[PDB]
């Protein structure tokens, strides 16, 4: 199944934050309506916050997360959780290697803000 | 129901990151085995990271998140999610007022690291 | 925080399934637009499916779960999870006593159907 | 990523319930310790329960769900959710065709029981 693609409310701010846990340098791309809106990168095995930003979901609300390590795409897992019918989290893990810890880059998207 | 309390595997590193979305100054306490292990405090209406730290779950694995604003405990909502039987997220939202957006302090706990 | 209340897309079929795990007889009421649309009752300590039914979310999409044991409301806990940006689960646990296993009546709502 | 595989606590009784939403007949196998422990089959486009059973997770706790339709394995999506640090759901959706509704067989695993 497709992973790392979420439908957000239209025209709404959301936070996106990325964490690294790998010997490889991660590159995280955040796409909004199929255009690159943010790119984060770093190298840490201790959960460094390699980027955080507030973005707007635009007219379609379509948000996609892509992760790659020196050009090769990582395998993604994802889900969305809603607490008390209001608070949303979209969660992404990714695997760049063979140990299947799926933490090599971790992306958290949260809304609403403010 | 009790919220904000999580059982982690013993002696496991985990990341904790807190965001703020409120006019009020948020104080986030992270307790490991009933003892304060980290405290974050900050104010933002734009999802600013008010703290991030790597902690160890200790011998009991009990982790608890408290949130208060000017000494008043916020109402909490929480859940844990596990992706591909390996990647864990413990998620907390909190409400300090009346609009019930439950984002006034948001806390994300993730493990494993490394 | 409020629990057991979910907003579904309007005029959408959904499944609702209740399980029991308690010495007390559980009564599960499912409200659609503030009106009782289904009710199930039974006693089991071995996860009996005390009822399963297909309902329609109506014009408002507002779905609420209520659980009581001998007229006393149980304490509820809930969340919603979305898989591959399509498949929705709304999950309810409830506690009728003091052991806080929150399985005394368990309710699963899933959509889409068909 | 691997989907439909879950590590339960050893020697624990859990419930498993399967629903169908497809023109195809679903066969759902539940494996404990890499052997088939239960098999459900049926056909419905209305979310019928095609089986429900209580099983033991055994010495290793490893549980796996597989779904076959028309002779071929369906693509799976899954996650695990824990509410109030005590109530566990392992959730599986599956796709036997081309419309990607991932509801063609839906499997819910819940524990603890009792
Ligand atoms: C240090 C190692 O770096 C890569 O091999 C990752 O895939 C591993 O999960 C681990 O983080
Ligand atoms: C600016 C406002 O500040 C407090 O009143 C919060 O409870 C609101 O959710 C909002 O963030
Ligand atoms: C058999 C017991 O019945 C009630 O006391 C429940 O609250 C308990 O959780 C347990 O199921
Ligand atoms: C009736 C249809 O039957 C199969 O084609 C399923 O894959 C579809 O999702 C739909 O349920
Ligand atoms: Ca890895
Ligand atoms: Ca790693
Ligand atoms: Ca608020
Ligand atoms: Ca707020
Ligand atoms: Ca109980
Ligand atoms: Ca019980
Ligand atoms: Ca299908
Ligand atoms: Ca279907």
Numbering used by the authors:
A (entry chain C), B (entry chain D), C (entry chain B), D (entry chain A): 1 to 114
Please give the exact wording used by the authors of the publication that reports this structure:
The opportunistic pathogen Pseudomonas aeruginosa, a major cause of nosocomial infections, uses carbohydrate-binding proteins (lectins) as part of its binding to host cells. P. aeruginosa produces two soluble lectins LecA (PA-IL) and LecB (PA-IIL) specific for galactose and fucose, respectively, that are involved in the bacterial pathogenicity, adhesion and biofilm formation. The fucose-binding lectin, LecB, displays a unique carbohydrate-binding site that incorporates two closely located calcium ions bridging between the ligand and protein, providing specificity and unusually high affinity. The two calcium ions contribute to the receptor specificity since they coordinate monosaccharides with the stereochemistry of two equatorial and one axial hydroxyl group present in fucose and mannose. These two calcium ions are also believed to play a role in the unusually strong affinity of LecB for fucose, which is in the low micromolar range, as compared to the millimolar affinity usually observed for lectin/monosaccharide interactions.
The neutron structure of D-LecB complexed with Fuc-d12 was obtained at 1.90 Å resolution, and was jointly refined against both neutron and X-ray data (1.85 Å) collected from the same crystal at RT. In all four chains, the fucose ring adopts the stable 1C4 chair conformation, with the α-configuration at the anomeric position. The deuterium atoms attached to the four hydroxyl groups can be clearly visualized pointing away from the metal ions, establishing hydrogen bonds with the amino acid residues in the binding site. The Fuc-OD2 hydroxyl group donates its deuterium atom to OD1 of Asp96, Fuc-OD3 establishes a hydrogen bond with the side chain OD2 oxygen of Asp99, and Fuc-OD4 donates a deuterium atom to the OXT oxygen of the carboxyl group of Gly114 of the neighboring monomer. No hydrogen atoms could be detected on the acidic groups of the binding site, indicating that these are all negatively charged. In contrast, the hydrogen bond between Fuc-O3D and Asp99 shows an unusual character with a deuterium atom located almost equidistantly between the carboxylic side chain of Asp99 and the O3 atom of the fucose molecule at 1.30 ± 0.21 Å away from O3 of fucose and 1.25 ± 0.17 Å OD2 of Asp99 with a very open O..D..O angle of 162.2 ± 1.8°. The very short distance between the donor and acceptor (2.47 ± 0.04 Å) and, importantly, the delocalization of the hydrogen atom equally shared by two heteroatoms defines a low-barrier hydrogen bond. Furthermore, the coordination of calcium and hydrogen bonds creates a network of contacts between two aspartate residues, each coordinating one calcium ion and accepting a hydrogen bond from a fucose hydroxyl group, forming two 6-membered rings.
